[PDB]
Amino acid sequence: ETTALVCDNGSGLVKAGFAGDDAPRAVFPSIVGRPRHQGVMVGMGQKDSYVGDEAQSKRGILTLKYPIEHGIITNWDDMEKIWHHTFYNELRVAPEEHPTLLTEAPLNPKANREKMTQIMFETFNVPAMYVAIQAVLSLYASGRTTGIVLDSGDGVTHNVPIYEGYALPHAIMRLDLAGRDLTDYLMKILTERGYSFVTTAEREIVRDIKEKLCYVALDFENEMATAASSSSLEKSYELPDGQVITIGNERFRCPETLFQPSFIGMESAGIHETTYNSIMKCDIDIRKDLYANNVMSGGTTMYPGIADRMQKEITALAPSTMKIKIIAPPERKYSVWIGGSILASLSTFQQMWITKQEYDEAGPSIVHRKCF
Amino acid sequence: ETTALVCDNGSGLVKAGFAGDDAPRAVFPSIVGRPRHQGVMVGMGQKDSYVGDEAQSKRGILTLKYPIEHGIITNWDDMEKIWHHTFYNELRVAPEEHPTLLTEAPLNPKANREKMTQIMFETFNVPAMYVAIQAVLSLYASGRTTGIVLDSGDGVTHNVPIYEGYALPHAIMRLDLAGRDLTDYLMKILTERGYSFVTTAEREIVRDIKEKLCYVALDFENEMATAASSSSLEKSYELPDGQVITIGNERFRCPETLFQPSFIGMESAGIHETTYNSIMKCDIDIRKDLYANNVMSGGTTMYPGIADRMQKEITALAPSTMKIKIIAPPERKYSVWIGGSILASLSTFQQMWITKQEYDEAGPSIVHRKCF
Amino acid sequence: ETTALVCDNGSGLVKAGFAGDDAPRAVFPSIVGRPRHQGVMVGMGQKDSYVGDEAQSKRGILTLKYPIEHGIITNWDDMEKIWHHTFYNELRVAPEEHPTLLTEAPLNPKANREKMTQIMFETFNVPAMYVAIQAVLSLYASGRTTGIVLDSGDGVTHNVPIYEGYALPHAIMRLDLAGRDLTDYLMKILTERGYSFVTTAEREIVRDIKEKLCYVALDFENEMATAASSSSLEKSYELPDGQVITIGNERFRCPETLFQPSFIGMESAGIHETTYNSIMKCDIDIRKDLYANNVMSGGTTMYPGIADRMQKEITALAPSTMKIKIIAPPERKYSVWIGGSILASLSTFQQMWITKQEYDEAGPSIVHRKCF
Amino acid sequence: LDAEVSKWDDSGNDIIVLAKQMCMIMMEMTDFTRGKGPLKNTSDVISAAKKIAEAGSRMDKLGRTIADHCPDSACKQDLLAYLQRIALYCHQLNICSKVKAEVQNLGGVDSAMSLIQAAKNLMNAVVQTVKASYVASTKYQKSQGMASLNLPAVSWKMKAPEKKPLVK
Ligand SMILES: Nc1ncnc2c1ncn2[C@@H]1O[C@H](COP(=O)(O)OP(=O)(O)O)[C@@H](O)[C@H]1O
Ligand SMILES: Nc1ncnc2c1ncn2[C@@H]1O[C@H](COP(=O)(O)OP(=O)(O)O)[C@@H](O)[C@H]1O
Ligand SMILES: Nc1ncnc2c1ncn2[C@@H]1O[C@H](COP(=O)(O)OP(=O)(O)O)[C@@H](O)[C@H]1O
Ligand SMILES: [Mg+2]
Ligand SMILES: [Mg+2]
Ligand SMILES: [Mg+2]
């Protein structure tokens, strides 16, 4: 009769809700803001920190910090503030009545998961908790059990190949290029238009620019060439102040970092080439099913036209005798949440939590021999 | 059960009263007059100095001096005379029974505030005192917490942008053009009509001329053009002697110095252009709320039609996609007092005074790490 | 047998000379002055604009404008006046006989460089021109090829890490805090002494105050503490009028903005923290050579004692097992010029100009695929 | 814009009911800017602002009563901050109404608009401290001092929020 709580603590958007549901009830950016000015009024000077949407509304007077950068957690005193805002202030449930399910990118440091379950037990007193891999839940949300997962969140971009039940942990390819690096490259590439976005409160504005304008070209060279004859690729976006900005080739040079990471100096391969590189790390028998089942979770795979370029860029690398199907579900931004609503509400799961009586005798090291 | 005293020591009008009230009890011009003639009668020759309205009534036989010029205080021996007239002679209270709240224009010299609190402690023996910024109280009086303040008093004209509680001290723009310079420019521009006002007792008369006649045109060039066909813009004002004077374009060339300070040779921008210049020093997120909340305290924003020209002159500089609302309250001349009646009577303020036991151990340098 | 012209068009000081030389022949402030008064004499009223030192000599009667603010050029009609004064009036050469080399801060708008080379070709008719990055020439002047460059000019402050030949364009960190903002903060902080510098002709005087008085403390807190016991840190400076001024802690609060940009409200890091932030954006192998080779060009690194504080403030951030050497050459104010005298006179360079026959067929867009 | 936040019932019995009274008097106060409610002149807006000032002082009293027994920082500092905000807003509204009344009886739309903006900020502060007092009460229900006030989590009528839209 009790329900389970699920909380995808992403790098840019904390999503949370109840198990068995079909949509997250709370979604808010995981920002902690400190005020940085004097505060001359005698009231409204005691509020020392702001979290979530009330920091997103007041971002002009706050230094903004994400506690999660590239999947790992660098500030625990802000992460417990964000979780305390998540459970009480927006979900309005007590943690002691519901078991909780958290989300972790693969190949993370063990100290991150250890301090995460220690904070979840010895501060909020949950009955039971479970941390799951951020990519294995995307296959639950897609309805499948085979396929490789290209989860490109805000922090990290990881490819996990999973045949029917069984993952292949020697082929989990985690690349540190994601939406925050595209946001910083859009800050760097909008300087050539004349616009200077320097503070951390303008990162939100250029993130909104990336939201509503940036698409990815099917072919990059000729689309770059037609931007020289600047006639139809410019687009105007209105700022919060009122000034309009015009954007030309910067509209599609920003997602092209996903397929050419040498633009920001990263010695790596693009997300089309590490996918074929990661399928080739697998065995030759399951390679046919992994080629034909390519799910894409994460918000950074919500650019207009990333499925077409992903298919076109794999099919020049794969052998040309069997098809590639980049299956891109339309709700994929919340996809990591949706599988979290499945696995927590599944009937055969309830003897695979981490109970509090199992934690206090074995310490926080119980989370490694239970989850992965 | 005790009340607090508030005393806005302006450059042209000392206003004073009790906290929690809705109107100042004492308002009088901050003038100190010395007699300058022989005094042949054997009585009425011992009264060495006159202050306030009894100097305003007898101004023909007195050299008149304002102790405050451009916000700073240049004559302490007259300022203590004005405060001694304020507390005892017109408010009729003792300073030792009531805490006091004084008013200071921003970006003033520190020695001014230091000698001000030293005079307030070691001469009048107040229980506690506080000095507040002249513009932050105008937002208390307007009922708001966001917006920029265009406080144009008699001494200085300062623009202070304040988002909800938090000021932005790097955008406080203080310009030394105010009502006294408009009075001197009206003395200079009335010479072309034939009238010569040369002494300091005629500055009061031409100030009254500025009171009852001078308005500000919405458009300056065509209003200057229609004054050439001199039919309806002349106005007659009666002097204290009985001679009438006729005023034509001098009726609106006097407030136009507020929007074109090159008339009196000041290398600056007008109060329409330093406002948009000061909003653009702020951050791009709070710029929408600062454009739409433009309070105007100070008596020099009581010209007939300054709100319309302020709105029309900002909206040619601001981006045209969101509105400008120059909110001009009708009691705005006393507005700096009204917020002073709020902040001193506020319940959460009483542990943010400067007590006498906090002053004697730290000296007069305690006022910098308490107020700003 | 022909020589090349080099012209560092800085934000506060245009420097220019011939290639192969060891010192600039012409150095003058890049100011354009319009007269702002009536001009009652019948002669001396036709001279409509003044540039360079003849505007610096007559600055009391001129509105002064810098055409370059924060690296970009906001007034082309004044910049062509400054270049026309540079070539003909002070260098006394024709531009058609010498190829020219101009200087550009990195991460500038492309339209700035485009209009710069269009003005250099279709107005002065140079045989060939080249624009170079303002920081890569400082390593030529320092004699090195590895190291990071902290070029803090008058407009911008940019850190560029360059290993032996190869720059790292993903770590070019450009911060908009430089000597003009320190000049404005010195105008703002000298108001507390009582001195009011309001017009644009007093910016030159307070710039001279910054020249001859302002040093930077090794430790800021105890040096602030010893300024309270005001005995030995005051210094007197004589104005052009004759009034002397005394300066206490304002002598070292002005360069401290370089290491704490929260004083002027800038959400950024100081030049000690963006340097370690920019070295950490590089790769782990070249980090040893970049730590030990820290050149400092630009005039704003000519404060007395900035090398000691830069070393002390990096070595608290860097790992303590290998040394930091802030190499500060004594001629560093002209350092951007000196490398410009090297690279233009280098024998292997002369097939990497932009000839006029290469420009007219490809338009002004040839400058992007030649310089960076 | 707190009608979507003011989804409650008449329960709570000390905090929620005056919050609903303040919400309906704001909804009738800011209708005067559209000008189709029961407010005609400006003096009834002064009486309305005095009503919200007295109700905000009462809410400040109840918020001070709940804040004594909260043990440490985690929500008590937030509650004290919102209490100082609602105290500033109510005390500013109280003697900002007086100067508008004295301007009214000594001599016309923006005069209402300043009090409207003050009431809007007061209502945002009061729904923020309602949320903070809910968190502080149902966080520490086993803690001593909270149990004597007799405010269980059932008594608050806060439901779970809406399903967020997955697409668009
Ligand atoms: N429609 C979209 N187009 C482009 N980028 C998007 C879109 N939706 C989301 N994003 C990017 O994805 C991020 C959404 O957060 P997300 O990474 O899904 O959270 P999590 O870190 O939990 O996976 C945002 O930072 C944004 O940059
Ligand atoms: N009704 C009015 N019309 C025009 N000017 C006014 C009016 N009332 C006041 N002033 C101007 O404003 C000044 C009033 O003093 P004020 O500046 O309000 O004092 P403070 O310096 O404390 O702000 C006078 O010098 C006068 O020039
Ligand atoms: N001796 C010095 N001490 C302190 N600051 C200096 C000194 N010399 C120059 N400066 C600063 O450096 C600037 C000199 O201009 P500079 O930046 O060298 O021109 P450019 O912009 O071409 O590099 C001035 O604005 C001044 O602030
Ligand atoms: Mg994520
Ligand atoms: Mg004043
Ligand atoms: Mg320079």
Numbering used by the authors:
A (entry chain E), B (entry chain F), C (entry chain H): 4 to 375
D (entry chain O): 698 to 804, 811 to 871
What does the paper say about this structure?
To understand the αE-catenin-actin filament interaction in molecular detail, we obtained a three-dimensional cryo-EM reconstruction of ADP-actin filaments bound to a truncated αE-catenin ABD (residues 671–906) at 3.6 Å resolution, which we reported at lower resolution previously. This construct deletes the first half of, and thereby destabilizes, the short H0, and binds 4.5x more strongly than the complete ABD (residues 666–906). The helical rise (27.4 Å) and twist (−166.9°) of F-actin in the reconstruction are practically identical to those of bare F-actin, indicating that the ABD does not induce any major changes into the filament. In contrast to the local changes in F-actin, the ABD undergoes large structural rearrangements upon complex formation. Compared to the unbound ABD crystal structure, the N-terminus through the last turn of H1 is disordered. The remaining four helices rearrange to bind to the filament. A key part of this change involves the long loop that connects H4 and H5, where the first strand of a β-hairpin becomes a two-turn extension of H4 (residues 795–801) that forms contacts with actin. The CTE past 862, which is disordered in the isolated structure, forms an extended peptide that interacts with actin. The backbone carbonyl oxygens of αE-catenin K862 and P864 form hydrogen bonds with actin residues R28 and R95. αE-catenin K866 forms salt bridges with actin D24 and D25, K867 forms a hydrogen bond with the backbone carbonyl of R28 and contacts V30, and L869 packs against actin residues A26, P27, E334 and Y337. Finally, we note that the CTE sits between actin and the next ABD along the long pitch of the filament, and V870 packs against V800 at the top of H4 of the neighboring ABD.
